[PDB]
Amino acid sequence: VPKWIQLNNEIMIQKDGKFQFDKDKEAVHSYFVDYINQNTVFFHNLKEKLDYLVENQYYEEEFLSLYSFEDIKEVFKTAYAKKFRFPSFMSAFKFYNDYALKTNDKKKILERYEDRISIVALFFANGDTEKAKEYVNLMINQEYQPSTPTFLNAGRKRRGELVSCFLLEVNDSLNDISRAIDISMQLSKLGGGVSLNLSKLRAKGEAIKDVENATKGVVGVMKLLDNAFRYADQMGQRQGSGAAYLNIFHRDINDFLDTKKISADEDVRVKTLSIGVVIPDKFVELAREDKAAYVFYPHTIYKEYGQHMDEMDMNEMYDKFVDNPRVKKEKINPRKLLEKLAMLRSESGYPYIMFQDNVNKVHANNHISKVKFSNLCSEVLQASQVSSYTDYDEEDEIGLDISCNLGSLNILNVMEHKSIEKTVKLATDSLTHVSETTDIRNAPAVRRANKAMKSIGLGAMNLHGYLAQNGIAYESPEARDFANTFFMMVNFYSIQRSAEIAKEKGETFDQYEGSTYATGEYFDKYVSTDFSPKYEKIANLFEGMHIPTTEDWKKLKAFVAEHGMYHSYRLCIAPTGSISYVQSSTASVMPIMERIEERTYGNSKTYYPMPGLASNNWFFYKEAYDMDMFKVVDMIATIQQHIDQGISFTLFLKDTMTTRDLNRIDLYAHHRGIKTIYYARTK
Amino acid sequence: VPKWIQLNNEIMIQKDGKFQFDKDKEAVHSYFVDYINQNTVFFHNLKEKLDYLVENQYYEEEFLSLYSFEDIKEVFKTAYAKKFRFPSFMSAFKFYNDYALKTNDKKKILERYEDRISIVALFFANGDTEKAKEYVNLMINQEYQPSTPTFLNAGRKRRGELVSCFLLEVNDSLNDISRAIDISMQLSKLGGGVSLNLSKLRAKGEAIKDVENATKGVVGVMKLLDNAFRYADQMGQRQGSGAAYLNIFHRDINDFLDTKKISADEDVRVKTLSIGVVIPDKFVELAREDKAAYVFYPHTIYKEYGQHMDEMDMNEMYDKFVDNPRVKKEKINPRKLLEKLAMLRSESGYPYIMFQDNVNKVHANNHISKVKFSNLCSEVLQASQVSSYTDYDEEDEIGLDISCNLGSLNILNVMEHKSIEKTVKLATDSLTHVSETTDIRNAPAVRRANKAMKSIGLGAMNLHGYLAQNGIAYESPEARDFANTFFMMVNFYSIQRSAEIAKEKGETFDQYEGSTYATGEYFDKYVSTDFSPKYEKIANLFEGMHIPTTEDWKKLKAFVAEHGMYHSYRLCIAPTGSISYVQSSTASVMPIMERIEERTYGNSKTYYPMPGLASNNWFFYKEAYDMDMFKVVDMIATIQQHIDQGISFTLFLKDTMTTRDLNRIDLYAHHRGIKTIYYARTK
Amino acid sequence: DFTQMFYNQNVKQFWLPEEIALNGDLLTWKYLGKNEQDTYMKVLAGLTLLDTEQGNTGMPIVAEHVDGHQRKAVLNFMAMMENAVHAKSYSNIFMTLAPTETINEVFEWVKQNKYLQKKAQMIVGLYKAIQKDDEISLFKAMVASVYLESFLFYSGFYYPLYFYGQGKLMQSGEIINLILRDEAIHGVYVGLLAQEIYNKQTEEKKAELREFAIDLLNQLYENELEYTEDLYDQVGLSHDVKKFIRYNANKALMNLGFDPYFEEEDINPIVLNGLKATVEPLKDDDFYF
Amino acid sequence: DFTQMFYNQNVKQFWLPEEIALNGDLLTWKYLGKNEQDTYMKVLAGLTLLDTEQGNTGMPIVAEHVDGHQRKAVLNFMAMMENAVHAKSYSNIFMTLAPTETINEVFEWVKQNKYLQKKAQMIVGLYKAIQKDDEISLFKAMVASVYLESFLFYSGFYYPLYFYGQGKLMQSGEIINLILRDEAIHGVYVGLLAQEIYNKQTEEKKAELREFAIDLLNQLYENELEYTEDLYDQVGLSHDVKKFIRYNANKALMNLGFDPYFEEEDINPIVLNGLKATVEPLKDDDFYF
């Protein structure tokens, strides 16, 4: 057992009835005195290091060639002047095991934290030394964290794509299904998580070229996609991850759900394909009134109306579908379906729940399309247009496939530096740069939507960490007040930066003129409701920072009207799995699952306390499972009212609560305006 | 139970110790006087029938519009003038259950045998009334039988494709793999059996752009193809059938074979994809000498030499592969691999065995490409060039994917009518028409190969029926002499018709100038060796027909040199599974499995005696399992010497014999020049 | 060739009574007529009584006389399912639907019932007649076992499946469907063990064993017809139940490698909705001809 | 007073070896000396033999003679665990760690090992001597079964536990701990049944039964000493294992309601370190907040 691992395991050993949290710090020192410095490759000067990394195909020549060597050296010096120290052993371990650049033999460390941050900053700035230094100060203060793809791969020649969330629309044809399989394989090859909408696909027992009972339904397509994702597994590094979304009014919805049951046969169950269910308000109304619902055959609806079932508003179309004899449908019990969803989420955490009307009643780009499905993490909610992939030697009709750009603000570090505006604007600029530098040659609709929509996702993390280190309970009304104010400022500065980029470049996102930004509707609740903190403690937390008022929001609305907005979507709160360790932050805006988490690496045990955990804030670091899920829903809705896309919202349940409690949480989330529900993790 | 069912079951009720074969005839009468005539749909005249079939989307109106109604009436009258009667109940039952056109609800019979034959003939003639009458006389005499796709689907609006088998070359890339999956689904949707050569795909543990041990090998692609064929299953009517072919020198050859082991795990086992193994002469030489062999990693060979492992001759490059340190290889025991092949064929009948050198030592189009794999029935052996399917928005390099049209001569009916020449020429014309009117819009390499190669497959059926009905034992040297003479005549007249078509159209198949037809090498054994019958009985059997001599072959060689050949490939002997029932013929050139076969249909059981089975020819209808497989190999080699493509050669084994006997049969087949071995069916 | 495969399928089908909540059946049970409730109770008791014989005698006696460690393990697993899972499941269904006094009376009635007793004792008689090291007597018992697993249970299973296919008594119907799924695989497995013995016999002995199997089937079938009318005439279902018995008799015969005895019939749609060659090394000179 | 709680405990402990991935032990196995690997293989092979006979013979035969459907259900479940779960798990371990030839050799070694044959002869002999309705022959077999469960397995269990306690072969060790957890409850349960029979006897008869139990224990013990030396001398652990088997002999006696026979000793501390959701329907009030 290594010395740093012993020093880390000494945390659980209680002295005077208290955990030895400070010992973790010592572990970090050991982890750097015994391992990191010994296995870190050192060079006589930075010029030699850069030459070795470029020549050995570690870095890219293009992004480094935009700067003189003096500017690169100045950026590296700015990164190293902070003298950044990892506060916990797990932060440094996760960085140097997951993100630090290693030799081809994986035994030496080529990149420190400052080196990786400097390289990512130089990639972000695209030739501006001052902008690169600003990015270096942003990331070394740990105010902003690029996502795992961006942080890991920026500036590296041997790399995947910087985007890892991809949403694909699948049209109801064999050509479109095969193209979707191909694109899923190509994007999993790039290292991205792929979500596919299967609602347009006709159900099982439908007609193919006017022969009856011929379609295999969406379950056969799910089997094909599951095989494709198993095959494309990042060159045998990570398990291929894919998601399939189906509307709850699709007839296959039960069989869809049956793919996640343990009792399902081998020809029914898909193991590497996550599933999500899109639930329109009509289904919730039918379940609430206990009226029996109807699941429709999509191809009959398409034949009758010329549009797909998921392309029209089910609230106004459901009665017409039911009363139409030419539309084929099957009787179901919506309450039984809700109970089945709750039971499946209890067993396996699936499916993801998308409340379609909750997403689309605040969606700014409904003119382009309504949000029909979400991503693999159930937080990307954007307009998508299906593509018509025709036969060979025939021109395809390329639509819009969602691929947003991830990046997370560290709420604790951002707010302690009183730099919400600067961090949000710099993160928006970096996300815009990464979106502009993304070029996928095997996903035509993804590339077209990246060029047109210019959608980015700016998330936040360390919400619970910040609240606990400031003596605020996550379920307290003060925490929701802080979340409201902080995320309203984040939205304000994100919109301001998007409008500034649109003014500078002279271009907005495609079909912006029809958006609620152009019409000013988006700013309605912002020009009438003041989002300043209602509690003195939160106001003192925001001291030293200008909180945008209704007049500021009116000025921003006028600015957007005059200049437009560059990004169709700006904010989405991703789970932030492993980057939260490196940043010493709690994951996403979720409450912490455990105060101290026990992990097993190799044959060794390691202990990670939550950041800033001590005896004084032990009570404020309440575990997520012990919390009331209604108050967690309230906080997530408070944040969601300022996020244009969704939030990865995992439910944290105890083994005691039943499926009725899960359904109640889901229905309260639907009532409170929650757009997506990610997971049902049972303790 | 139906009256005809009782009459057919009365065959096995012996009277005076003999089977009541004549009862079978009675059954047909019943089957027509109680079911077919009552279930048939009669019109006032042919005009109303044709109009009803045209407007109700049963028939394509284009092929019928090329004839005036008087000509169509004359063709139908020619078909009905023969007064064709089905001699066995099973012939009529199979036609009216599998090939006769029925209504949309399948409650009535719209097409008689004469109606189907007339429609197929009118489609074949393409506006020529005299040619349509010639086709009608050829098919109503049952001298020639179009394949099941062509016979069933010719002239139908709801038809599929007339091509039975498709062969795809899969290049070593994710884009090519995805395109192969798409094309396999498209062609299975069209109803054709798809064969894919996986020998170019790099083995398991190869590098995908400098990251090693990343590839899943051919087994992952096999699983993808298996799921694709499961999904595309002819709209749920016929199970999707696919074939995978791998060279025996591929490193994955064991894992390949492990897909068919009955103890294979679900993550490896493949159940809807047939497997074939391509064995060069080098492997047989290594096994014979008991020298340990080496299987190779295709990607290392491609990197070192710039060509795929199956793209070059292993007999001359195996030592270079072994001595090359930059080529990666694994040690295997070739005798152990042969024993594994024999055990697998005993257990499940797989893999198909393709003796590559036996195919390519007489292959006429080696300049275009060597034959690297076979079809799903292991009888199509043609040159194929792999396609380079590139990224989206990039032009693809379209290669040649094999596809040929099947058609079988009924040997008994052809020789009874003394019309080898006329039947062969008319069948060649019909297959040329089927190739010309075939246009597949989702398989580009298949379309290009169909347009360029113009390859057709003219098979033969009722070899054993003709031999047994003429008092010739199938294993006798007289039977092999008859096969030699008959198939030399078939080859002569097929070459003559191909050259005549090339002369009349002024065009040959692509790259004909480099073929052995153009250089005259193909005719060598035909201009030096006489293939006239060596037995007086066979010569009497061939009386009334001009058997080509060496002078006729020299004249044909000169004619080909002057005019060329329209078809790259002309003769391939398919299994002819279910259409042999309608023709009252034994399946293909294979010996009969059983004298009387008991088949269960619905809740009833039926007995089909072999065509012409009686007391005097009971022992001439020797069952295949009771026959010496070495003499069957001799027969198949004798036929194969006159067939440019392969023959679907099924091995018929007894349970008592061991895997060593199967290996001996395989090695004798390789020694005798057998190109492919189809199945190892054990009694 | 088959025991490890059946081992896998058996253990992956493992389940426990507690997994299905039964109380919600009372919401449809209360709406059935007296004849429907009476038939259901009697059918249930019939299944319970027969399955107890299989758990206490049928499976353990076959496990005792069959040679092979892996076969004994699979057979032990099947015996466990009878005694630990199925028996508790039947008891649970009863305790949910009837009060204690009603359960005791139904079992008293079914215990005295002529048609239930006839078949129960016929099967048990063959299990008791197995002799050590006599494969003929073992085969006869295996035939009896297959007939119970794949045939005799089905006059009983009909009714719960009939309700299950209509949306009635769904919780107990789910339990019955799991039980039935176990008995199906039990019947197939024991059938393969019987065929192994059958295939070791002479042609005359085979013909004699076939006659035994058909004669036994006939006796059981004629009693099933009487059993069926006795239970199902009062609810008007006997005609359709008889079709279901014959269909399952044919499955039992096929499990024993025999031809179907009865003509193919369609089944009630409501019930439907409820429902190595010897390796010899190459010796060289096999490559030369 | 106890069968129901044993039934519940046994079924809640249900497991399969496939739940535990074994490829993690590959390296710590590779690193052991040839002597250590040899002893380990042989130890598990000896365990496999014991479980084979406990599953095939011991548990089913005791089940046959013990009265009461619930008692029989527990004993049937325990029998299934012996041969369908425990005995099979050892093959999972063997197939992961060892090449086929080494596996073949160790199974040949069990057949010819005189101590393993002697202990099987003695235990199985007593099982097969049980006479119907003869409670004394049944008691004797139950004593033999307790000695197998709670004493005889332990010369084998020592070594996987010894490694587990050092952080070696921990996946195999996890399997062994699950097996041991099962045998502990099996030994207690059979012990309670044996005590039932013993408590029915006169004082004179009881005195004879204690003599039988102690004589049998000593005879098994003396054989186990020789077996232990034969296996463990090459790894230097024989004296340590001997202390462990004496410790467990006392536990077996206690399971039978008898006083400890061997004096207490310090056991190697390494070995000591080696030791659906509920568903409610949705109310109309759950849709309003």
Ligand SMILES: Nc1ncnc2c1ncn2[C@@H]1O[C@H](COP(=O)(O)OP(=O)(O)OP(=O)(O)O)[C@@H](O)[C@H]1O
């Ligand atoms: N907690 C830590 N986080 C990150 N790096 C660390 C940490 N502790 C030590 N290091 C690394 O080890 C070096 C030694 O740091 P130490 O605590 O011994 O003193 P120092 O005054 O920071 O040293 P130096 O002269 O290297 O700057 C640091 O410069 C840094 O590179």
Ligand SMILES: Nc1ncnc2c1ncn2[C@@H]1O[C@H](COP(=O)(O)OP(=O)(O)OP(=O)(O)O)[C@@H](O)[C@H]1O
């Ligand atoms: N074996 C058969 N094959 C094909 N069609 C048959 C067969 N048997 C009967 N039919 C059909 O059923 C009709 C019944 O007539 P059948 O053969 O009994 O003699 P028919 O009334 O004297 O006239 P004909 O033989 O001249 O048609 C036939 O005309 C024919 O259309």
Ligand SMILES: Cc1cn([C@H]2C[C@H](O)[C@@H](COP(=O)(O)OP(=O)(O)OP(=O)(O)O)O2)c(=O)[nH]c1=O
């Ligand atoms: C992407 C991917 C490829 N492969 C295998 C199958 C293909 O035959 C083979 C080639 O993939 P390619 O698509 O050719 O990958 P590449 O072009 O980026 O890499 P290279 O330059 O070396 O050609 O890699 C996998 O096994 N799994 C995968 O996920």
Ligand SMILES: [Mg+2]
């Ligand atoms: Mg379409």
Ligand SMILES: [Mg+2]
């Ligand atoms: Mg490539």
Ligand SMILES: [Mn+2]
């Ligand atoms: Mn049972």
Ligand SMILES: [Mn+2]
């Ligand atoms: Mn059973």
Ligand SMILES: [Mn+2]
């Ligand atoms: Mn055990």
Ligand SMILES: [Mn+2]
């Ligand atoms: Mn035990």
